Design a protein around this ligand. Sequence first.
Ligand SMILES: CC(C)(COP(=O)(O)OP(=O)(O)OC[C@H]1O[C@@H](n2cnc3c(N)ncnc32)[C@H](O)[C@@H]1OP(=O)(O)O)[C@@H](O)C(=O)NCCC(=O)NCCS
Length: 596
Amino acid sequence: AHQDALPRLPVPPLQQSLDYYLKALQPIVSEEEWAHTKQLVDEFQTSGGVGERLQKGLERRAKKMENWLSEWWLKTAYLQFRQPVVIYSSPGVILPKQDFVDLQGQLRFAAKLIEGVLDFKSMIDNETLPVEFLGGQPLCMNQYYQILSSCRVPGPKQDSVVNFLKSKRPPTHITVVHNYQFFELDVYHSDGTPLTSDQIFVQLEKIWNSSLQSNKEPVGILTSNHRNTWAKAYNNLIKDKVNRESVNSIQKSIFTVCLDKQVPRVSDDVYRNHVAGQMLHGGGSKFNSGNRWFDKTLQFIVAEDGSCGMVYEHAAAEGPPIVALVDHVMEYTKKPELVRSPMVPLPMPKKLRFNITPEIKNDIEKAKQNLSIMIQDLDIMMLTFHHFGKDFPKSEKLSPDAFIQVALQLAYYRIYGQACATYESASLRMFHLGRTDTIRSASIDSLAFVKGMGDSTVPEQQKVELLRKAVQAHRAYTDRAIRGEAFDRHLLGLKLQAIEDLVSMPDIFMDTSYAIAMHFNLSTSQVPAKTDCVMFFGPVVPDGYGICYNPMEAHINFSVSAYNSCAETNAARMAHYLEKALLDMRTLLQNHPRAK
Ligand SMILES: CC(C)(COP(=O)(O)OP(=O)(O)OC[C@H]1O[C@@H](n2cnc3c(N)ncnc32)[C@H](O)[C@@H]1OP(=O)(O)O)[C@@H](O)C(=O)NCCC(=O)NCCS
C-alpha cells in the first residue's frame, strides 16, 4: 500500500522541456546549428502543430497507465539492445577484498555471503524493507522485487525477462558454478526456516567436491555473444530434455554464485584493473568467463585470492537498489555468531548437466572468439581519490556530486578543446515504478567556467565565481531532473508517441543537434555505497568513456572505461586529468573565501 501513496511520473510542459533543450544545446552545438534548432523548436510548439498533438498523447498515456515510460524505456534501453550484455549493458562491481587464504576460507565466505542475501530477501518477501528517501519524499521500492529469482531470455527480435519471485512455488534454490559446471542448491527447509551458514557450507562443501576436476566445455559462455546468435544458439541448446531442465533451473535460481579459478597474477599498480575485468567480463575464454551466466539477474562472484564482487543485468534495476543490498550483505559477513547447532539431515545437490553436441560445439567455440575480442578492446582504469571526498565540497557549501561533475567537464575540456554531450544517470524513484532520467552536465555555466579557468586573462577572483556558478547551476538541473522536470525522457516520449500515432517522424528528431545531444562522450552515474566498493561499465559510444564513481566522505572510488578501437580515448589519461581537475578546483576555492 506504499506504492499507492507515491505520485505518478508527470509530463513536463512542452514549452518548458523544449526550452531546457535549447539552453543545454548551446555549449555542445555550433552557433549555426543552434539557430536552426531554434526555428525548428518554435515551429514544433506552434499552437496547433505536431508537438501540441503528441504532447496530448503522453498526457493521455498517463491516465491509462501507472507509468507512461515504464514499458517504452525498458524495451528501448535494454530489451531491444541487440549487442552483447557484457561490458555494454551489465555493470560489474568490486567489493572490499576478503582475507581468507585457502580453498576452505573461500567457501566459508560464499556461505556467509549467501546467508546475507536471504536475510535481505526476507525483508523483500516479508515486504519489511525500510522506506528509502530521496530528500523529503518516499522512493519507489519496486526494483527490489525484480532482482531475485529472475533472468533475461534471448528473443529473435526482442528479449524477455522471466521472474519467478512471486509465483506458485517460489524457488528455494540458487545456482553455483565451479569449473564451468553448474549445481543447484536449496537453502530452505520443509519447515520455512532458512539454512544457517553451517548447512549451506556443508552443502557448498558437497557441491564443491562434485566438480573438483575441470574438463567440460563452458556452455555458459554462450550468454556473452551477440543477442541474435545466442537467441538461435539458446534455441538449439534447449532441444534436449536434460538441457532444458538445466537452463530452466538456472532461470529459477534465487541468484548465482561463482567460484572462479586461479589466474596468473600481475603487478599491483594494474591489479585493481585485473579484478574489475574479472568481475565485468571474466577475463577471456580460458579463465573465468565460462564460470558465468550473464543472463541471470544477480551473479555473485567470489574469487580465490580473496577478491570478490558482482555483475547484474541492468533491465531489472539501477545500481542503488543493488548496492542497498550489498551494504546489508557485506554487513552480515562481518557480524558475530549465534547458534551453530548440529548439522540437520541435508540432501545432496543436483548437478545441472549439459549434453554437449557437435552443433553446440561450434556455438561454444564461436562464443570464445567473440568474447575474447570484446575484451582485447576494453580499456579500464580504477581511480581512488584520497585527497578528499564529500568532506571538502560540503565544507565549501557546495554540492559534492555537482562539484565532481564540473571537474569532469574541466578535465574533458582540458583534453579535446571542446565541451561534449555528457550524461549523468538521475533516478526518478520518487515516482511509482519510475526508473531514471538524464542530467546533462554540459551547460552554459559549465562551458563559461572550464574556459574562464584555463584563461590566463581571467583573474582567480572571477574564476572562483565562475566555478561556484556552475556547481549550483548543475545542482538545479539535478533537483529539476529528479522531480520529473528534465527533458530527455519526455523528449524520447514524443518521439515514440509519434511513431505510434503513425505520423511523419518530426524534423526536430531528425535534427543534427539531436544526433549530437544523444551522442554521449561522457556516460556517467553516481552509486553511493556505505561500503568501500566501486561499480563500472563500458562506454555508450565508440568514441567516448564510461564513468561511474562512489563518493565517500574522505575519498572517491572512480571507474573509467574506454575502447582501444578508438585511438581518441585513453581511460588512464581521463583518470589522470580528472584527478588534477578536482585538486585544482579545491586550490581555487581555498584561496578565495566567499566568507570568513
Ligand atoms: C542526482 C543524485 C546523484 C544526487 O545525489 P545527492 O546525494 O543529492 O548529491 P549531493 O552532492 O547533494 O550529495 C549529498 C551530500 O552532499 C550534501 N550537500 C548537497 N548540497 C550541499 C551544499 N550546498 N552545501 C553543503 N552540503 C551539501 C548533502 O547534504 C549530502 O550530505 P550527506 O553526506 O549527509 O548525505 C541522486 O539524487 C540520484 O538521482 N542518483 C541516481 C543514481 C542512479 O540511479 N544511478 C544508476 C547507475 S547505473
